[PDB]
Each structure stands twice: as C-alpha cells, then as structure tokens.
Design a protein around this nucleic acid. Structure first.
Lengths: 86, 106, 95, 98, 93, 105, 81, 98
DNA sequence: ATCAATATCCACCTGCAGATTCTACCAAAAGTGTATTTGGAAACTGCTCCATCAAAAGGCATGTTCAGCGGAATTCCGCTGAACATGCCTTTTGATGGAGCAGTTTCCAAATACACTTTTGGTAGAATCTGCAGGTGGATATTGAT
DNA sequence: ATCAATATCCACCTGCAGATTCTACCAAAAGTGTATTTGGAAACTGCTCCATCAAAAGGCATGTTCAGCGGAATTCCGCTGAACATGCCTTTTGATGGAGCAGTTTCCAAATACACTTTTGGTAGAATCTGCAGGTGGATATTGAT
C-alpha cells in the first residue's frame, strides 16, 4: 500500500558513471578515492538545490516539485539553467 | 494603423515588451522608448547567437540547430562566453579540450 | 483554452534572416526563449536599480542604454547600443 | 593478444565524451537519489519528470565543471591523476568551502 | 538637509546587548550597510516569490520564505521565530 | 497614538520599513504584517552581530566596537560568515592564520 | 622618472601578501600582481564611471564605487548604501 | 653582528600585518593610478575622497584574498614560494580568467 | 647548555580626535479617520500527468587478473629570494580659490487612466512534410609489438 | 621501418519521430482617441569639498651575501587502466487509477487613496566628556651563534 524505503541511493552513482563525467571534464587518470569524494560532493550539491526547490514548492502550496521550482532554485545559487521553461 | 514593432523596424514585439516592463515592478513609470530600445537589443543578441549557432550546425553538416550547436556557438565566442558565464545549456555538452601534458609521446 | 506566450515566432523569423535554410529543434528553441527572457530580466532589473539610485521614477531608453553598457562585454555593447538608438530614432520619426 | 597501453583508451574516452551531450549517470538511479534526498527534507512530495531531468542536467554540468578544475589542480602539482585533495583545493578556491 | 539611516535604532539595540559598550562612526556605517543589505536581499527574494506565484501582494508569508531561503540554518530558525513573534504581538493589540 | 514598532515590540522602524517596501518596486501591494516581520528579522540580525562584535571588543579589552571587531565577530561565526561571504568589511583586516607548513621546523 | 602602476611598490605588494599569509615570494610576482590589480580597477572604475555619467556628474562618488562593486559581486560595507 | 634567518622576519611580518587593518599601499600612488585608469573612460573627472578610499579598501581586500588562494596553490604543489602560475591557477578557478 | 642581540609584552600616563549629551527647529513622516476598491482564500471541478505495476532483453555494471608506469621518497646542487645597513627622494600633512554637487522655480512634452475598435499570436489537432538517427560495411588511419 | 589488430572516418540508405504548415475560432492584446496629471530637463544659485601648492614627514631603492628552496635525476613499490567473463537491472513500451494542479464563481477581510492631526528623527552651531593611541620603562621571551 506504500513506499519501499529509499536507502543508500548515492551508490547508484556508479564508479563508471563517475569516470565518464571525469572524462567529459578532460580527466585522464583517477585515483581510487575519487569516487567516494565525488558522491559526497554530489550529495551536498543536490541537497542544497533540492532544499531550495522544495521551499518554492511549499510556498506555492503544491505537493509537486516543478521544473520551474528547480530552475528558480538553481538561479538562487547562481547556476542559471536554460532548457526547461527556464 | 501601424504596429509599434513595425514603426521601430523590429521583429521582436515592442508592445509585449512594454507590457512586461510595466507589470514587472521595475519602476512606477516606463517611457515609450524603453521597450523599443530593449526589444532592439534583445533582437540583436538573439541574431548574434543564432548566426553563430547556425554556423556551428553547418560545420557539423546539420541543417537543424540543436542545443549542442548553441553551446558551441556560445563557448567559442569570447563575448557571449563571458555574458553567459553563469549559464548552463541543457544537452549542450562541453568544448573538446585536452590539456597538452595529457597527450602521449613527446 | 490554454495560452502561454513566448518569443519563439520572433526567434524563428530572425533565424530565417541570418540562415534562410536552417531549422531549429524545439529544445534549442526553448533554450533561445530562455536566453531572450534572461536578457530582458537582466537589463530591466539593471534599469530599475539605475532609476532608483538616481531618484527617478521613470525607466526610459536612457536607463536601458546605461544598463546595456553595464551588462554587455565591449563589442556586443557597442552594437546593442547602435541597434537600440537606431530603433528609437526611427520609432520617434513616425506618427 | 592485443592490448592498448594505459592511458590510450582513457584519451579515446575523453574525446568521445567531450564530443557527446547525453547524460552520463543512469536515469532511474539518479531519480531514486533525488527522491530519497527530497523525502528526507519533506515527505509526500511528487516530481514532474522534467524537474528530475532539470536536476540531472544541472548536477552533471556541475560535476563536469568541477572535474575540469580538479584536473588543473592535479596538473599544477605535476600529476595527471586527480586525487581527493585536488577536488578539495578546487572547491575551496571556488568558495564552496573557502 | 536630511539623510535617513538606521544608526539610532542600531545604537539602541547595541545597549540592550552590551549596556557598557560603544561603537565608532565607521563601525556604525558598516552596521547600517549590513541592515540595508539584509533589507534588500529579503525584499528582492519576496518580490520574486510573489511574482513566481502571480501574487500582487508581499505578505509576511513571502518574507518568511525569503528568510528561510536566505539565512543559514540556525540564523533562519531564530529570525523566523522573531518575525512570527513580532507579527503575533502586533496583531494581538 | 502608539507607534507600530512599539506595538510589535521592536526598536526598528516598522513605519519606515513599510514605506521602503512600498517605494522599492517590489510588488503592487505590501501587507501590514510584512514590514513587521521584516523589521524584526533586521533587528535580530543586527543584535546577533553587535553581541559578537561586542565580545570581540571585550576580548581585546576595549569598550568601543570598531570595524576590526565586526570583522572578527563575523568571520569567526560559521553562519554569519556564510551569510556575508560576498561582503568586504572596510578596515576589518583578516583573521590571524598561518598555514602550518610555513611554521619553523 | 616613473609610471603610475609602478607606484604600487614591491614592498606594498609584499605587505599585502603578508596579510594574505604568504611567506616566500618569487620576483615575477610583482609584475603579475600589478597586472591583476590593473584589471580589477579597470573593471570597477569602468562601472563606477558609467554610473557617474548616467547621473550627469563629473565627480565619481563613493556610492558610484559601491554600486559598481556590488554588481561586480564585491559588496563593500562602510561607504554608504 | 646579529642576523635573523630567512623566513623568520617574513613570519614576523605575517603576524604583524594579519593583526592590523591599515591600508598597505600608499595613498598618493594609488590615487594617481585610479585617476589614470578613469581618464581612459571619461576625461576631466573629479573624485570624492571617499570614492578613492572605497576603491582602495576593495582593491586591497581583493588582492589579500587572492594572495590567500595563491598560497594554497603553491602549497598544493609542495612549495612555500608563490609564483605567477599560482596566481593564474587561483584566478582561473575563481572564474576570473576562464 | 651558554650569552647576547632583539623582539615582545605589560603597566602606566594623558593629550585629543572623535563620541556621547543637551536644545530649539521643523520639514518630513508616521499615525489616524472615511470611503472605495479588490486580491486571493474558500468550495466545486474538469483532465493533465504522476506514481506504479508489467514484462522482455541487452546495454552496462560488477568483479577479477595482470602489469605498465605514475607517484612519491631520496639525494643533490645551482641560484634565487630574504635579510640588512645606507643614502635620500617621495608621500604625508595642512592651507586655499573655485568647480560643481544639491535644492529650487518653472512649465511643457510625455506618461497615466480610460472607453472602444481593430489586429494578432496561440493552439486544438487532422494532415502533410522531412532531417537525420542508426544499422552496415568498406577506405584510411592510429597503435603497439618487433 | 614493415606488420597486424583495431579504432575512426565518412558517405550512402530509409523508417519515423519530430518539425514546418494549415483554416479557423478568438480571448487577450495592442492600437486609435481625448482628457488629466506631472516627472524631470533647463536655467540660476550658494555652500561643499575637491584639486592644487608649500613644507615637513618617513618609507623605499639599491648592492652585498648566502641560507635553503625548487627542481632535476634516479629508483621502485604498488595503484590504477585495460580486457574479459558473466548476468543483472536499467531502459523501453504501455496502459491505468486518481492525486492534485490549474481554472472558476463567490465575496469578505484587508489594502489603496486622499485628507488632516500629531510627532519623531535629523541636525547645526555650542559644550563637554573620554576611550585609547602612542610614548616611556623595564621585564622577559625569542632567536641564533657557539
């Protein structure tokens, strides 16, 4: 009738996915400890943007986070995003 | 009766822009020339970006401009790159760029 | 009915003027629409502060011009200023 | 048995990914991560599919840009291998922990 | 000949916190800039909040959300309580 | 006639804050409670900084708060430092800090 | 005789670095610093002067500088605003 | 014939200047520089004295902050001497260079 | 470990630049009383689209093996910066005409507020149009062993 | 420098999702035409405070000497890249129940808009008070040579 507890999903960001992102970033060699440090960095980035995005949602009295809530949250952080109605 | 855009010699909607300025809480009053000037600048900036993106599309042997073309046009242009330094273009990727020290041999 | 405005048709016209035989995907058009709106907001907000700092209650072509100079990089500014002044001079010559 | 020397395939990978624009993180896993984090801040939230995609496009652009800076820090120290300390230096200069 | 500033109120608040402490002119100018900076940041965020939700009015609710968006954790917590308390005390009279 | 600040139990000028919101082009209308809430937040933030700056002055055996003191108060507080990370305090100097690796062998 | 940017002397630059916690300085730093300072001032002054002209003045005010620094993302407290 | 070893006095200077708040560049020279640069944007300009002071406080705070980041880059490369390439890395990562 | 040249620190002192205190002045606000207008919360609602289960399959993650070569410890020396005494040229400090920053009176070109008339951008959505993704294979490299 | 195992290149081919193209209804704009209100440019003014000049203040430029930092070389351990086997879980295609978002008609608490009374905050010319910046003294830690 409900959920399916969401746990440790940060591991979904796999070593291969991280290697690929580093490749696009021009990185040639990656030390073993880079993957865990990257997950931590991604989590902080996501928590900060999501927190703000959810704050705009609540202010509007909605239960659904919109693409504009994210765009506005990104703008607050100085990371303007083009392509989603913003 | 002529449209204000026509009188201004512009494609971009002067009337709409005048209305957006009045409703956007920018000032108690908005003069008639403000929206004309703003629409002209907006149109000029759009033209500059589209000119560069279309060239990027041609270079990739494409007829249709896609996000990647807009991204290449902007990042390869010094001034647009600076104007849009805080911008992220979805599905735009990055410019090919490999630090010299990373290449093999000597 | 459900209506949402955008600069899409104007962007499309300008695209045809610079590249007669080039098209544009909806996603790229969405990015162009966000770009035009971003420019509008930056210039308007800058003009707004400008009028406030000088105790002016009216935003005129002169505030828009100064804002453009503060916002755009060297060459773009010069050309924006010309297109702007040109559109106003011509707009004023009519009616 | 043929074998490319270490670093040859990595370079081929850099050229390949710098040429493409698709998202590099798997979609479903990223979506669970977003829902998990959001849930911890507020329960019962729903998400437009484009909201999740907006977050993924931004997160990936953020990480790629961070790795470029991290790469310059490794190179500055005369290495070609990025390490946790390169990421820390970059984040610190950027003001993400300055 | 006027020129408005928050100097007198800042000074008064200073004495509640440190009855025996003074403040130099330059320091007072900095405090004034700080108060104005805060006013502008909050007001601008509330402006956006109202515009995003197609609202014509800026109410205590926009100020609150703006506060949560702008101040770090604990600071926000207390600012929110102080804000809610002043509105309550204001209405209860 | 009692003032709104007193009514809200604040020192900061609710009437002035109200006028500033109205003429600052923030929105077509400003509710009565908005300036009250805002005034209280500004007051609290000012209190927070003056308390810490005051302590910094006492730490240096001085009774008068100067820029240095505001700088020490803010940069030594994790939250205020973050809130004001983009701000420069005139005549504030910097916090004493020498990278360990630079200290004598 | 002299040049203005050279007015920012080696010792003055050393002092700034010291407040910045720097212990050893290479000789090439001085010219690199002057160039960096020149770019910083050109950018802020250009904006400050633009506010001046807009207000039809011939005098650059502290507020013009404060507004220019704020839009360059370098908010300065203690000089108005 | 007394003599302090290299670094001892530099360390003393760091402690001294990190304690103080006075401007470290001389006034007149800074004033001349500011006027020269301004002259290129508009001629025959006057400056309130407070304008020149705001400019010197901002400039000095900016350079000090940069010297801090530069120091971290030199140290990252296992050096204790800052070099132009350190200033460049810091500026590049700050986004002032690219 | 032992002096010895120096920097650092603490207690005390007092002139004075800058801060707290007092007062009449009064324009500029803030508080107040009345009438008019309205934003947006409340209750009912049509349908967009989000959460979710379904099932198949291959793209991609996981885990292992093997060894190339990058990172990092070590030794070493050429030379670059730090420290410093010396000689003095520039900045700092304080006095004075005038450029120009503000406040002021004026009045018109221009911007609201408004009742209507005219033109347009959006879009639902059945139908036609078409650039290029993606599977295929062969020409031209690009690598790495020898 | 020849060879072989592979990746890269690039033009040709066609199903198909996605883009260009309607004919028309049209709410919502945008434009035409008085009537009323007024923001701020233009010309004139008087007090600030900014630029300039003289004289006194004190920081910088310069050459010597060498301590120790930076970096070139050498060395080797073990981490990280490449390749391969295996099979899982993401991706894709699809339809469904219904939560909830965007729209709607109602309508009152609250906000705007003059008009008028009360008063708080700002300040100039005058008085007075004081925190603390330097300046002296003498004790003691710091640093560097022996």
């Amino acid at each position: 009738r409900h959920r399916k507890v969401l746990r440790d999903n940060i591991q979904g960001i796999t070593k291969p996915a991280i290697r690929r992102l580093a490749r696009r970033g021009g990185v040639k060699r990656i030390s073993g400890l880079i993957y865990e440090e990257t997950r931590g960095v991604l989590k902080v980035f996501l928590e900060n943007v999501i927190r703000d995005a959810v704050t705009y949602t609540e202010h509007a009295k909605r239960k659904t986070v919109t693409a504009m809530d994210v765009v506005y949250a990104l703008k607050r952080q100085g990371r303007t995003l083009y392509g989603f109605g913003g | 009766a002529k449209s204000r855009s026509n009188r201004a010699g512009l494609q971009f909607p002067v009337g709409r822009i005048h209305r957006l300025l009045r409703k956007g809480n920018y000032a108690e009053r908005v003069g008639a020339g403000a929206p004309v000037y703003l629409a002209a600048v907006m149109e000029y900036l759009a033209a500059e970006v589209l000119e560069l993106a279309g060239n990027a599309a041609r270079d990739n042997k494409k007829t249709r401009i896609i996000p990647r073309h807009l991204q290449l046009a902007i990042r390869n242009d010094e001034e647009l790159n600076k104007l849009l330094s805080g911008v992220t273009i979805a599905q735009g990727g990055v410019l090919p760029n490999i630090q010299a020290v990373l290449l093999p041999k000597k | 009915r459900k209506r949402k405005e955008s600069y899409a048709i104007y962007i499309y016209t300008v695209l045809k003027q610079v590249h007669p035989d080039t098209g544009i995907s909806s996603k790229a058009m969405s990015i162009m629409n966000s770009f035009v709106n971003d420019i509008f907001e930056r210039i308007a907000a800058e003009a707004s502060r400008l009028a406030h700092y000088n105790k002016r209650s009216t935003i005129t072509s002169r505030e828009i011009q100064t804002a453009v100079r503060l916002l755009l990089p060297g060459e773009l500014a010069k050309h924006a200023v010309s297109e702007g002044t040109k559109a106003v001079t011509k707009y004023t010559s009519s009616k | 048995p043929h074998r490319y020397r270490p670093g040859t395939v990595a370079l081929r990978e850099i050229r390949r990914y710098q040429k493409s624009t698709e998202l590099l993180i798997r979609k479903l896993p990223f979506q669970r991560l977003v829902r998990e984090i959001a849930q911890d801040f507020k329960t019962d939230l729903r998400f437009q599919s484009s909201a999740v995609m907006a977050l993924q496009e931004a997160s990936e652009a953020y990480l790629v840009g961070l790795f470029e800076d991290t790469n310059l820090c490794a190179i500055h120290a005369k290495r070609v291998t990025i390490m946790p300390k390169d990421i820390q230096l970059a984040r610190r200069i950027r003001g993400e922990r300055a």
